[PDB]
């Protein structure tokens, strides 16, 4: 009888509404990313669909900036929306300082936005979870923004119905500074082991960046390699 408004704490002190949206995200297909030797990468599962759908518009991975990009998981509506804010916020940040200096305050802007919606009635939080990754004055970057505005910088993490199983893996197999191609597969394995018996990990999209270079999206054939 508490889980009805975004602004009511339970007797334990929980905000069931906010949680329920962390639940909407858990209904979205898995996706992880990890930094390595000069740069980071991102992997996203995608259970191939209607061939009538222009593949250009079904990539859980998006280029916010040339040197930064992210991936979401949850309500598709809220997905697109947030994505833009990122892209948009990116710019403002980029114009008041001459360049996207710290990828952090890009994630801040987004976190602060998402957070708000979990404190006022008349509104509902975003049922999305975003993983940002790129290169800034500092170097490889990886953050994961949840529905409640919570942001944490990783070396490797994931979102989606898999997350747990994918982190369970990395959390006992991941070893930093791997040479791109090597880190690529490790994640591939990690990702693999999150599916359910019988399922065959189809072709997942992947993109990377490396100190001094712009991102790049592995094309379905360069990807078909780690299969």
């Amino acid at each position: 009888a508490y889980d009805r408004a975004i602004t009511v704490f339970s007797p334990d002190g929980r905000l069931f509404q906010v949680e329920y949206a962390r639940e909407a995200v858990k209904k979205g297909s898995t996706a992880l990313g990890m930094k390595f030797a000069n740069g980071v990468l991102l992997i996203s599962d995608k259970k191939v669909r209607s061939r009538l759908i222009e593949q250009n518009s079904i990539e859980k991975i998006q280029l916010i900036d040339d040197y930064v990009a992210a991936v979401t998981s949850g309500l598709v509506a809220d997905a697109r929306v947030l994505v833009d804010f990122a892209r948009i916020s990116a710019q403002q940040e980029k114009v008041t300082y001459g360049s996207l200096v710290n990828i952090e305050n890009l994630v801040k802007r987004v976190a602060d936005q998402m957070q708000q919606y979990t404190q006022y009635g008349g509104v509902r939080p975003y049922g999305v979870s975003l993983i940002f990754a790129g290169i800034d004055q500092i170097g490889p970057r990886l953050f994961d923004c949840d529905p409640a505005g919570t942001i944490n910088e990783y070396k490797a993490t994931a979102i989606g119905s898999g997350k747990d199983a994918v982190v369970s893996f990395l959390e006992r197999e991941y070893k930093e500074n791997l040479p791109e191609k090597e880190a690529v597969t490790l994640g591939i394995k990690a990702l693999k082991s999150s599916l359910e018996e019988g399922e065959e990990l189809k072709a997942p999209e992947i993109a990377s960046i490396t100190v001094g270079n712009k991102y790049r999206i592995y094309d379905q054939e360069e990807v078909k390699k780690f299969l």
């Binding site: 209904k27 979205g28 669909r49 859980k60 949850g74 598709v76 997905a79």
Partner: protein, 219 residues
């Protein structure tokens, strides 16, 4: 493995299994129902048209028994046939959640009714307690007949009793009961037809507690 077990069950008891039951009800079943109706409806007058004496309490009015029997059996069948549809729905009650139960309720009402049907299919002697509509004789009709009749026979056979009403009471049980037969059959008709209606109107949801193409809003 679990999921297989669930599957294995739903398979042997498919929509077409219960759907079949619905057809048999709109066809054959209904006929027989009314058939017993006419049989008793008549066997009834067959008795109202007569005066009782020590003899009628010496031998059990066979014609009646048959009428009751056909009734008993008919219920019996409808009952099992009913049970079928139950299972069909019961083995398809989705995980217990608090939302999206939209379908579910459908299964519920569709069951809650099934109950009434079979509940009124199964007998029960005037228990004298419930405030609702006393249950039509049903299954145990046959029994309860003899039970009440035998009682009056003893009193009249043995010396024997002189009560003139005790006599007419015998006469009554014979008729009163044939009445009770059509009275319950007329009802079953009503009941069935409704069920048939209800099922045929919700089956899509009955089997599909709730649809899920989530892939379009979550991803």
């Amino acid at each position: 493995k679990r999921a297989a077990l669930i599957q294995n069950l739903r398979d042997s008891y498919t929509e077409t299994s219960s759907f079949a039951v619905i057809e048999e009800w709109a066809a054959g079943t209904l006929q027989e129902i009314e058939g017993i109706a006419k049989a008793a409806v008549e066997a009834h007058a067959t008795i109202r048209n007569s005066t009782y004496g020590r003899a009628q309490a010496e031998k059990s009015p066979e014609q009646l028994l048959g009428v009751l029997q056909r009734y008993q059996d008919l219920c019996h069948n409808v009952y099992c046939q009913a049970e079928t549809i139950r299972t069909v729905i019961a083995i398809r009650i989705p995980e217990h959640k608090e939302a999206d139960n939209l379908g579910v309720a459908v299964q519920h009402a569709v069951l809650k009714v099934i109950d009434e049907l079979e509940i009124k299919t199964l007998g029960s002697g005037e228990k004298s307690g419930s405030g609702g509509a006393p249950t039509p004789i049903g299954m145990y009709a046959l029994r309860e007949y003899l039970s009440a009749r035998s009682t009056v026979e003893d009193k009249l056979l043995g010396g024997g009793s002189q009560s003139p009403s005790l006599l007419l009471e015998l006469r009554q049980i014979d008729a009163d009961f044939m009445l009770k037969v059509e009275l319950a059959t007329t009802h079953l008709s009503t009941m069935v037809r409704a069920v048939i209606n209800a099922y045929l109107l919700n089956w899509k949801k009955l089997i599909q507690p709730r649809g899920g193409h989530l892939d379009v809003l979550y991803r």
